[PDB]
């Protein structure tokens, strides 16, 4: 992130037999396989293990307070496969620690990469009995059922956005605990917070970064002054973010309160997906990895400069054995310690395929219903192309979902050309792009094919935290339209997401046409840009009810949720349809649907049309009757107006 006022020393190579940390032969040395990296606290002793093969000396530095002076500095013993060990024979509860190493001529001090608790702003590791952080009844925590990734409805949310608006009616504004408060009310008495979210019928809340991110993003010691950040600046991967706790200065508070949040979501029928950012760290020069083992954990070009394919300054070297181990053990920590139900991998194309498949394999051993989705964008890096976990390699990543950007841009228009129209806004030639997404991105037939082998690999969305909101994109691409016409386009885009095969994904506030005032990239914009505006929600309760009704329609019809590509190819049929419309049927009780056949019309044409319907039986209106002038029994549909219509032939 910043200019480093200092030196990186890559080591005295005599320590490693003349083999440099950059050499390809280095990877086969020092591959520790134990499960005890970090510190293990017991009442009579704490055991430390540090992986630092290039260091000539290593110490545990003990502190009594989070901002105090060292009270003890103990040398560690060189142990197996590049590690250092130390047992401190005292009760270390309540203490803090760092490691100090000598690498080359430099002495460096760093937080434990395997930290499970930290002091304020994450500058020291906190020693802690994590069992003391478990909520009452945590042992009885039970997940809501989930039969298929296609049965999930994901709701993407930032912990600060949720509650920081002054009329949210939530007491612990901006905190994990704000999402545990039930019966909260907003303007005109509307439900807000948790009750609003459960009322929508979504199944998964995907939380923007809840791991500990950098002080430059949010200073945890100055929370009495304005602050906001998405948090894509990782500092401590295995501990929660301090600013979402009621007391950033109490190491246990953030841990207990996140567990209480997850417990409450599960009890209210919601699963939790964690946004994880293993592709980069906040600052490649200052991160603990670089202080402890410089040159290993991050990717370097041949000329020994950082590979910067993330556009964040650095990339994590996920393909090197000890970093692969780190990432896997981190994910398993969040699953085992925090009962997390899924992961969304930021810039997944920066992670190697072997690592991603091992993650998916290890999670399947625990619970196959844990979700794994990610940004599988094709992006350049020093990591060879055939190893990148992106769309081009999706056939090598079974069971991992990827955001379907092809569908996104077909529906609402190019996200990088703000004024360019798409299907909903009357652009020409987007119908096949919408059809490709309807089919869940699979190889459906003809030119209707995308990257997915199976529909569980395709996450459908028209809004997320990145880029303009759907409302703001519609505004920029429809300068000649009225706001009433724009609201109809907005509703159509949401209907396309929720009636397409694959995994539907909604951005928090999409239900009330969330706006950021035209801000394209709001990662550090103030709360007035980023909050969930509960006043707008109160003015848009009909639109909220429409989203709720779309979610209910998808739940009522398993034909929208087919689990396999073979079923989609057997049951989904596209019908002849005029420009600026798409029409399809889901035939023969698809996926166990109660109705014999469904017909779905996506109508982006504002005028009156008479459409031919397939002769499959006595059609009746199930959704979108506000657009239907008549249903003629040679069957025909008389429609007017932009929106979705769903018909059914009953059993």
Ligand X SMILES: OC[C@H]1O[C@@H]2O[C@H]3[C@H](O)[C@@H](O)[C@@H](O[C@H]4[C@H](O)[C@@H](O)[C@@H](O[C@H]5[C@H](O)[C@@H](O)[C@@H](O[C@H]6[C@H](O)[C@@H](O)[C@@H](O[C@H]7[C@H](O)[C@@H](O)[C@@H](O[C@H]8[C@H](O)[C@@H](O)[C@@H](O[C@H]1[C@H](O)[C@H]2O)O[C@@H]8CO)O[C@@H]7CO)O[C@@H]6CO)O[C@@H]5CO)O[C@@H]4CO)O[C@@H]3CO
Look at residue 223 and give the partner it binds from Cl ion, Ca ion, ligand X, none, a contact being a CB closer than 5 to 8 Å depending on partner kind.
Cl ion
**Candidates 187-195, 242-250, 473-481, 524-532; binding stretch for Cl ion (CB under 5 A):** 242-250
Residue 565's H or E segment, with its range, is helix 565-571
Instruction: State in angstroms the smallest separation of the CB of 354 from Ca ion.
Output: 18
Query: Which one of residues 174, 294, 401, 504 is an interface residue with Cl ion (CB under 5 A)?
Result: 174
Whole-angstrom Cα distance, residue 292 to residue 50?
9
Q: Which is nearer to ligand X, 275 or 341 (CB)?
A: 275
Q: Are 57 and 15 in contact (CB under 8 A)?
A: no
Binding site for Ca ion (CB under 5 A): 212, 242, 399
Q: Which is nearer to ligand X, 13 or 476 (CB)?
A: 476
Instruction: State in angstroms the smallest separation of the CB of 220 from Ca ion.
Output: 5
Look at residue 399 and give the partner it binds from Cl ion, ligand X, Ca ion, none, a contact being a CB closer than 5 to 8 Å depending on partner kind.
Ca ion
Whole-angstrom Cα distance, residue 574 to residue 582?
8
Q: What is the largest CA-CA distance in the chain?
A: 88
Whole-angstrom Cα distance, residue 284 to residue 313?
7
Q: Does 223 bind Cl ion (CB under 5 A)?
A: yes
Size of residue set near Cl ion by CB under 5 A: 4
Residue 203 makes CB contacts below 8 A (sequence gap 6+) with 144, 146, 151, 152, 153, 154, 269, 270, 271
Task: Kindly name the residue from 181, 346, 352, 463 that is annotated as catalytic.
Answer: 346
Instruction: State in angstroms the smallest separation of the CB of 321 from ligand X.
Output: 27
DSSP 8-state secondary structure symbol assigned to residue 254: H
Q: Is 109 annotated as a binding-site member?
A: no
Here's the x/- map for ligand X, 203-242, by CB under 6 A: it reads as ----------------------------------------
Q: Which is nearer to Cl ion, 393 or 603 (CB)?
A: 393
Q: Is 36 annotated as a binding-site member?
A: no
64 a catalytic residue? no
Instruction: State in angstroms the smallest separation of the CB of 353 from Cl ion.
Output: 12
Whole-angstrom Cα distance, residue 141 to residue 270?
12
What are the tokens at 85?
């060990």
Question: Looking at beta carbons, which residue is closest to ligand X?
Answer: 625
Here's the x/- map for ligand X, 41-80, by CB under 6 A: it reads as ----x-------------------------------x---
Instruction: State in angstroms the smallest separation of the CB of 254 from Cl ion.
Output: 11
Q: Which of residues 337-396 bind ligand X (CB under 6 A)?
A: 377-379
Alpha helices in 119-191 (DSSP H): 159-163
Q: Is 212 annotated as a binding-site member?
A: yes
Residue with the two structure tokens 């907003």: 186
**Number of other residues whose CB lies within 10 A of the CB of residue 559:** 27
Residue with the two structure tokens 């019309």: 601
Q: Are 108 and 292 in contact (CB under 8 A)?
A: yes
Q: Are 382 and 374 in contact (CB under 8 A)?
A: no
Q: Does 7 bind ligand X (CB under 6 A)?
A: no
Q: Which is nearer to ligand X, 123 or 214 (CB)?
A: 214
Task: Kindly name the residue from 112, 275, 375, 543 that is annotated as catalytic.
Answer: 375
Q: Which is nearer to ligand X, 386 or 419 (CB)?
A: 419
Question: Looking at beta carbons, which residue is closest to Cl ion?
Answer: 378
Look at residue 174 and give the partner it binds from ligand X, Cl ion, Ca ion, none, a contact being a CB closer than 5 to 8 Å depending on partner kind.
Cl ion
Q: Are 254 and 187 in contact (CB under 8 A)?
A: no
Strand partners, 119: none
Whole-angstrom Cα distance, residue 588 to residue 579?
27
Look at residue 212 and give the partner it binds from ligand X, Ca ion, Cl ion, none, a contact being a CB closer than 5 to 8 Å depending on partner kind.
Ca ion
Q: Are 240 and 211 in contact (CB under 8 A)?
A: yes
Q: Does 549 bind ligand X (CB under 6 A)?
A: yes
**Number of other residues whose CB lies within 10 A of the CB of residue 292:** 25
Size of residue set near ligand X by CB under 6 A: 26
Look at residue 626 and give the partner it binds from Cl ion, Ca ion, ligand X, none, a contact being a CB closer than 5 to 8 Å depending on partner kind.
ligand X
346 a catalytic residue? yes
**Candidates 34-42, 169-177, 247-255, 630-638; binding stretch for Cl ion (CB under 5 A):** 169-177
Q: Are 29 and 321 in contact (CB under 8 A)?
A: no
Whole-angstrom Cα distance, residue 404 to residue 502?
10
Q: Is 220 annotated as a binding-site member?
A: yes
Q: Which of residues 591-630 bind ligand X (CB under 6 A)?
A: 621, 623-626
Q: Which is nearer to ligand X, 366 or 417 (CB)?
A: 417
Instruction: Give CA torsion, residues 403, 407, 409, 411, to 10 deg.
Output: -130
Query: Which one of residues 167, 467, 515, 605 is an interface residue with ligand X (CB under 6 A)?
Result: 467
Q: Which of residues 84-123 bind ligand X (CB under 6 A)?
A: 87, 89
**Number of other residues whose CB lies within 10 A of the CB of residue 268:** 14
Q: Which of residues 283-302 bind ligand X (CB under 6 A)?
A: none
Q: Which is nearer to Ca ion, 223 or 267 (CB)?
A: 223
Q: Are 260 and 177 in contact (CB under 8 A)?
A: yes
Residue 646 makes CB contacts below 8 A (sequence gap 6+) with 499, 553, 598, 599, 600, 601, 621, 622, 623, 624
Whole-angstrom Cα distance, residue 634 to residue 335?
56
Look at residue 623 and give the partner it binds from Cl ion, ligand X, Ca ion, none, a contact being a CB closer than 5 to 8 Å depending on partner kind.
ligand X
What are the tokens at 194?
């948790």
Instruction: State in angstroms the smallest separation of the CB of 167 from ligand X.
Output: 22
Q: Are 85 and 76 in contact (CB under 8 A)?
A: yes
Here's the x/- map for Cl ion, 341-380, by CB under 5 A: it reads as -------------------------------------x--
Mode of pairing for the β-strands spanning 154-157 and 503-507: parallel
Q: Does 188 bind ligand X (CB under 6 A)?
A: no
Instruction: State in angstroms the smallest separation of the CB of 307 from Cl ion.
Output: 14
Whole-angstrom Cα distance, residue 253 to residue 111?
19
What are the tokens at 387?
């190893």
Q: Which of residues 403-432 bind ligand X (CB under 6 A)?
A: 405, 409, 414-417
What are the tokens at 410?
């077909």
Q: Does 636 bind ligand X (CB under 6 A)?
A: no
- Short-list 379, 211, 403, 385, CA closest to 308: 379
Instruction: State in angstroms the smallest separation of the CB of 636 from ligand X.
Output: 18
Whole-angstrom Cα distance, residue 638 to residue 322?
63
Q: Which residues are annotated as a binding site?
A: 212-213, 220, 241, 475
The residue ranges that bind Cl ion (CB under 5 A) are 174, 223, 243, 378
Q: Which residues are annotated as a binding site for Ca(2+)?
A: 212-213, 220, 241, 475
> Which active-site residues does the annotation give?
346, 375
The residue ranges that bind ligand X (CB under 6 A) are 45, 77, 87, 89, 311, 377-379, 405, 409, 414-417, 466-467, 521, 542, 545-546, 549, 621, 623-626
């Amino acid at each position: 992130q910043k200019e480093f006022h200092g030196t990186i020393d890559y080591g005295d190579v005599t320590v490693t037999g003349g083999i440099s940390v950059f050499d390809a032969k280095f990877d086969e040395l020092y591959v520790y396989d134990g499960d005890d990296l970090g510190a293990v606290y017991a009442p009579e002793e704490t055991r430390f293990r540090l992986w630092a093969p290039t260091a000539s000396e290593a110490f545990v530095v003990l502190y009594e307070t989070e901002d105090g002076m060292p009270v003890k500095e103990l040398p560690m013993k060189r142990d197996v496969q590049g590690t250092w060990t130390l047992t401190v024979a005292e009760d270390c509860g309540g203490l803090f620690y760092t490691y100090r190493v000598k690498v080359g001529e430099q002495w460096n001090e760093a937080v434990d990469p395997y930290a499970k608790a930290v002091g304020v702003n994450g500058t020291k590791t906190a020693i802690l009995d994590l069992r003391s952080t478990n909520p009452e009844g945590w042992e009885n925590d039970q997940k809501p059922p989930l039969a298929s990734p296609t049965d999930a409805v994901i709701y993407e949310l930032h912990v600060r956005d949720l509650s920081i608006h002054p009329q949210s009616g939530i007491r612990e504004k901006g905190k994990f605990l704000g999402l545990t408060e039930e019966g909260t009310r907003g303007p005109n008495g509307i439900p807000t917070g948790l009750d609003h979210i459960t009322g929508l019928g979504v199944t998964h809340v995907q939380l923007l970064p809840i791991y500990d991110y950098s002080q430059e993003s949010v200073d945890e010691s100055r929370l009495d002054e304005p602050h906001y950040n998405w948090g894509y600046d990782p500092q401590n991967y295995n501990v929660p973010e301090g600013s979402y706790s009621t007391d950033p200065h109490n190491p246990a508070a953030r841990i207990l309160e996140l567990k209480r949040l997850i417990q409450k979501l599960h009890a209210r029928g919601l699963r939790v997906i964690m946004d994880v950012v293993y592709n980069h760290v906040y600052d490649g020069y200052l991160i603990h990895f670089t202080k402890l083992v410089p040159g290993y954990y991050l990717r370097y070009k041949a000329d020994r400069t950082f590979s910067d394919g993330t556009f964040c300054g650095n990339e994590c070297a996920s393909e090197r054995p000890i970093m692969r181990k780190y990432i896997i053990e981190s994910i398993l920590h969040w699953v085992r310690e925090y009962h997390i139900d899924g992961f969304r991998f930021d810039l997944m194309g920066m992670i190697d395929i072997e690592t991603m498949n091992e993650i998916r394999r290890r999670l399947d051993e625990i619970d196959p219903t844990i979700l794994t989705i990610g940004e599988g964008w094709m992006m350049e890096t020093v990591l060879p192309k055939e190893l990148r976990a992106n769309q081009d390699n999706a056939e090598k990543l079974p069971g991992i979902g990827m955001f379907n950007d092809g569908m996104r841009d077909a529906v609402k228009g190019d996200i990088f050309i703000f004024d360019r129209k798409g299907f909903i806004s009357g652009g020409d030639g987007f119908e096949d792009g919408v059809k490709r997404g309807v089919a869940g991105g699979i190889n459906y037939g003809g030119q209707l094919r995308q990257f997915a082998v199976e529909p569980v690999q395709s996450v459908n969305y028209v809004e997320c935290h990145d880029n303009h909101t759907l409302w703001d994109k519609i505004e920029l691409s429809t300068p000649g339209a009225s706001d009433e016409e724009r609201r109809a386009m907005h509703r159509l885009a949401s209907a396309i997401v929720l009636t397409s095969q694959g995994i539907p994904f909604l951005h928090a506030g999409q239900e009330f046409m969330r706006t950021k005032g035209g801000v394209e990239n709001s990662y550090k914009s103030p709360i007035e840009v980023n909050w969930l505006d509960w006043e707008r929600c109160a003015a848009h309760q009909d639109d909220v009810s429409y989203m709720r009704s779309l979610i209910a329609l998808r739940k009522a019809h398993p034909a929208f949720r087919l689990k396999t590509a073979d079923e989609i190819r057997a049951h989904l049929r596209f019908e002849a349809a005029p420009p600026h419309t798409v029409a399809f049927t889901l035939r023969d009780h698809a996926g166990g649907d109660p109705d014999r056949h469904l017909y779905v019309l996506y109508n982006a044409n504002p005028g009156a049309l008479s459409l031919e319907l397939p002769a499959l039986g006595p059609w009746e209106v199930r959704f979108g009757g506000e657009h239907v002038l008549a249903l003629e029994a040679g069957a025909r549909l008389e429609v007017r107006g932009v929106g979705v219509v769903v018909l059914a032939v009953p059993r």
